[PDB]
Design an enzyme around this catalytic site. Structure first.
Site, mmCIF file in Angstrom:
data_model
loop_
_atom_site.group_PDB
_atom_site.id
_atom_site.type_symbol
_atom_site.label_atom_id
_atom_site.label_comp_id
_atom_site.label_asym_id
_atom_site.label_seq_id
_atom_site.Cartn_x
_atom_site.Cartn_y
_atom_site.Cartn_z
ATOM 1 N N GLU A 165 -12.690 123.818 -12.998
ATOM 2 C CA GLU A 165 -11.323 123.949 -12.490
ATOM 3 C C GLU A 165 -11.196 125.078 -11.462
ATOM 4 O O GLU A 165 -10.502 124.914 -10.451
ATOM 5 C CB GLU A 165 -10.324 124.138 -13.633
ATOM 6 C CG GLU A 165 -10.133 122.908 -14.505
ATOM 7 C CD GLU A 165 -9.372 121.781 -13.829
ATOM 8 O OE1 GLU A 165 -8.913 121.973 -12.681
ATOM 9 O OE2 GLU A 165 -9.266 120.690 -14.455
ATOM 10 N N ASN A 171 -1.195 120.114 -5.217
ATOM 11 C CA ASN A 171 -1.325 118.724 -5.623
ATOM 12 C C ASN A 171 -0.534 117.843 -4.654
ATOM 13 O O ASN A 171 0.398 118.313 -3.990
ATOM 14 C CB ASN A 171 -0.752 118.550 -7.025
ATOM 15 C CG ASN A 171 -1.674 119.062 -8.124
ATOM 16 O OD1 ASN A 171 -1.664 118.518 -9.226
ATOM 17 N ND2 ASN A 171 -2.456 120.099 -7.849
ATOM 18 N N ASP A 225 1.748 115.743 -5.166
ATOM 19 C CA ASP A 225 3.164 115.625 -5.496
ATOM 20 C C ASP A 225 4.022 116.840 -5.152
ATOM 21 O O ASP A 225 5.211 116.848 -5.446
ATOM 22 C CB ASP A 225 3.343 115.219 -6.972
ATOM 23 C CG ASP A 225 2.936 116.312 -7.946
ATOM 24 O OD1 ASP A 225 2.576 117.418 -7.505
ATOM 25 O OD2 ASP A 225 2.992 116.063 -9.162
ATOM 26 N N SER A 230 3.511 119.920 -6.371
ATOM 27 C CA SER A 230 3.193 120.959 -7.332
ATOM 28 C C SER A 230 1.910 121.674 -6.910
ATOM 29 O O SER A 230 1.217 121.238 -5.984
ATOM 30 C CB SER A 230 3.047 120.371 -8.734
ATOM 31 O OG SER A 230 1.909 119.538 -8.798
ATOM 32 N N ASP A 235 -1.517 123.983 -8.800
ATOM 33 C CA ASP A 235 -2.255 124.419 -9.971
ATOM 34 C C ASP A 235 -2.696 125.867 -9.800
ATOM 35 O O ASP A 235 -3.123 126.274 -8.710
ATOM 36 C CB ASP A 235 -3.504 123.554 -10.131
ATOM 37 C CG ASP A 235 -3.195 122.111 -10.415
ATOM 38 O OD1 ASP A 235 -2.160 121.821 -11.032
ATOM 39 O OD2 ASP A 235 -4.017 121.272 -10.029
ATOM 40 N N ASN A 277 -0.446 123.532 -13.997
ATOM 41 C CA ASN A 277 0.419 122.927 -12.997
ATOM 42 C C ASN A 277 1.877 123.367 -13.046
ATOM 43 O O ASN A 277 2.476 123.522 -14.117
ATOM 44 C CB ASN A 277 0.309 121.396 -13.116
ATOM 45 C CG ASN A 277 0.984 120.655 -11.973
ATOM 46 O OD1 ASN A 277 2.128 120.202 -12.100
ATOM 47 N ND2 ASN A 277 0.300 120.560 -10.836
ATOM 48 N N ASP A 295 -0.244 119.078 -26.416
ATOM 49 C CA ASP A 295 0.784 118.154 -25.905
ATOM 50 C C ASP A 295 0.565 116.693 -26.310
ATOM 51 O O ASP A 295 1.472 115.876 -26.166
ATOM 52 C CB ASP A 295 0.877 118.290 -24.375
ATOM 53 C CG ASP A 295 2.005 117.482 -23.762
ATOM 54 O OD1 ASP A 295 3.181 117.761 -24.068
ATOM 55 O OD2 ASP A 295 1.706 116.584 -22.948
#
Ligand SMILES: [Cl-]
Ligand SMILES: [Cl-]
Length: 129
Positions: free
Chosen positions: A35, A46, A48, A50, A52, A59, A101
């Site tokens: 990562e 990202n 969209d 967003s 990270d 995110n 989650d």
């Protein structure tokens, strides 16, 4: 801060990630390697809108607030910049929420694609933990 491999393993262990939700320490070290290259300062936009953040590339749409992400929920209740600190506490706390989650470590794309199903113990080989 760019952590050493065993240095990061020791920090993650101290913070209670070893076997957290059943994920052995090597899983977490492997995820961080791919990562962020163990770099707390890593950021990546990202598609969209967003971004990270940090060693575990958390995110800004669901987890942290960066002030510029549409639909942001800030479920970890932290500014995304806190995830860039040399102190990994905030990243670990938020990662614990993420991994709880429902999808376990599949939340981390690099973990699923590069760590899952591999000999992850190799990532902590040689370390004094
Ligand atoms: Cl392991
Ligand atoms: Cl799981």
């Amino acid at each position: 801060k760019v952590f050493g491999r065993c240095e990061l393993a020791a920090a993650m262990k101290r913070h209670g990630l070893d076997n957290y939700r059943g994920y052995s320490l090597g899983n977490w070290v492997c995820a961080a390697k791919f990562e962020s290259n163990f770099n707390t300062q890593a950021t990546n936009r990202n598609t969209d809108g967003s971004t990270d953040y940090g060693i575990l590339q958390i995110n800004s749409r669901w987890w942290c607030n960066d002030g510029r992400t549409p639909g942001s929920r800030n479920l970890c209740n932290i500014p995304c910049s806190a995830l860039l600190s040399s102190d990994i506490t905030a990243s670990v706390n938020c990662a614990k929420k993420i991994v709880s989650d429902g999808n376990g470590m599949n939340a981390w794309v690099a973990w699923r694609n590069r760590c899952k199903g591999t000999d992850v113990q190799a990532w902590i080989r040689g370390c004094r933990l």
